[PDB]
Design a protein around this ligand. Structure first.
Ligand SMILES: O=C(O)c1c(NS(=O)(=O)c2ccccc2)ccc2c1CCCC2
Ligand SMILES: [Mn+2]
Ligand SMILES: [Mn+2]
Length: 369
């Protein structure tokens, strides 16, 4: 009934009623004709629709409460001096328990991203990484949870030196502006346009030098499908236009990235993230090690992302060759770290939002951000 100091009680065991707490519920922003949505709030049909998908939203909520209670715990102990591995393992151990891990029914949506400084996304330590968090590092903690495939992609930036304060603020504000500007019938390009107006209205000072915060042009937000971290649509982050419009009932990961470098990321360092291609079908394989690894991936991760450590813990050993095979065969896709130029700094803020018929829900919102 009550959560223990160091979190240990599944979110499921904390709410005996089976109903989980909603996120921040906003009213879809108007348009040119000031077209308010004070009607969707209680329209008769839009209310029935929402009630129809009620169990889905509830799943997203059970996953968001896991995320909120885990990141809250991480913010109390993450300190420079700890290795990137100890950090991720302490974060995932807790996350496995609150979400009440259970095969594909409930678990960790993707690996724990702790991309450092100029690296903005997709870096997680591999066995052997001796990297230690430093007082001057700007670490992006990006991890996800899920219940029955309903994914919560939510992230924040951690720092210990205040010289980054105003940078985090630029990006946190850009992220919120994106969340606030999003909604049914809103064109992606417009969301990107705005996120950039705000983002670039900030300018910071770091170690004597001064920069105008830049959105990482080739990074962005995305729509979220069941067991599919990237459903299909994308949220710009800059003057990009895409060619689409957000629709009713969609789930989006709103995230923005700010940088002091070029505002462009590139594949860098060693690969840790991997994910079975959703579109790819059943391919027959006779090669032993490859066949067995693919079985492990289907059994433990489905089309959800994973990392080398997650293979290690399952007892898998010497599997890089088999992994490269699945990658070459196009069955598995590698997701390397995305880093901007050396010396630059980068920050991120992400939230998962539900575009429900009656109102817009920032399901992953919390006391913190
Ligand atoms: O970060 C993600 O949400 C993500 C993704 N989505 S994305 O292509 O929109 C993207 C967004 C931000 C940074 C990099 C990629 C696509 C594939 C993957 C991820 C995270 C885990 C690894 C696989
Ligand atoms: Mn993320
Ligand atoms: Mn994301």
């Amino acid at each position: 009934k009550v959560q223990t100091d160091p979190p240990s009680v599944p979110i499921c065991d904390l709410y005996p009623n089976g109903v989980f707490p909603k996120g921040q519920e906003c009213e879809y922003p108007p348009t040119q004709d000031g077209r308010t949505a004070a009607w969707r709030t209680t329209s008769e049909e839009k209310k029935a629709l929402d009630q129809a998908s009620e169990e889905i939203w509830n799943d997203f909520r059970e996953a968001a409460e896991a995320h909120r209670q885990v990141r809250k715990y991480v913010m109390s102990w993450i300190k420079p001096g700890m290795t990137m591995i100890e950090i991720c393992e302490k974060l995932e151990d807790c996350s496995r328990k609150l979400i009440k891990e259970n095969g594909l029914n409930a678990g960790l949506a993707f690996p724990t991203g702790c991309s450092l400084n100029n690296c903005a996304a997709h870096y997680t330590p591999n066995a052997g990484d001796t990297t230690v968090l430093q007082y001057d590092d700007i670490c992006k903690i990006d991890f996800g949870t899920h219940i029955s495939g309903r994914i919560i992609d939510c992230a924040f930036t951690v720092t210990f030196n205040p010289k980054y304060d105003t940078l985090l603020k630029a990006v946190k504000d850009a992220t919120n502006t994106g969340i606030k500007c999003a909604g049914i019938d809103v064109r992606l390009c417009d969301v990107g346009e705005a996120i950039q107006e705000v983002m670039e209205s900030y300018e910071v000072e770091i170690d004597g030098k001064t920069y105008q915060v830049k959105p990482i042009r080739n990074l962005n937000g995305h729509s979220i499908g069941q067991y599919r971290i990237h459903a299909g649509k994308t949220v710009p982050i800059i003057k990009g236009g895409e060619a689409t419009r957000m629709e009713e009932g969609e789930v989006y990961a709103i995230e923005t990235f700010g940088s002091t470098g070029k505002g462009v990321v590139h594949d860098d360092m060693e690969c840790s993230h991997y994910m079975k291609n959703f579109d790819v079908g059943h391919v027959p394989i006779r090669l032993p090690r490859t066949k067995h690894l693919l079985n492990v991936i289907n059994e433990n991760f489905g089309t959800l992302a994973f990392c080398r450590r997650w293979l290690d813990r399952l007892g898998e050993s010497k599997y890089l060759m088999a992994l490269k095979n699945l990658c070459d065969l196009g069955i598995v896709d590698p997701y390397p770290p995305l880093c901007d130029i050396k010396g630059s700094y980068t920050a991120q803020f992400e939230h998962t939002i539900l575009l429900r018929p009656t109102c817009k829900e920032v399901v992953s919102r919390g006391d913190d951000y």
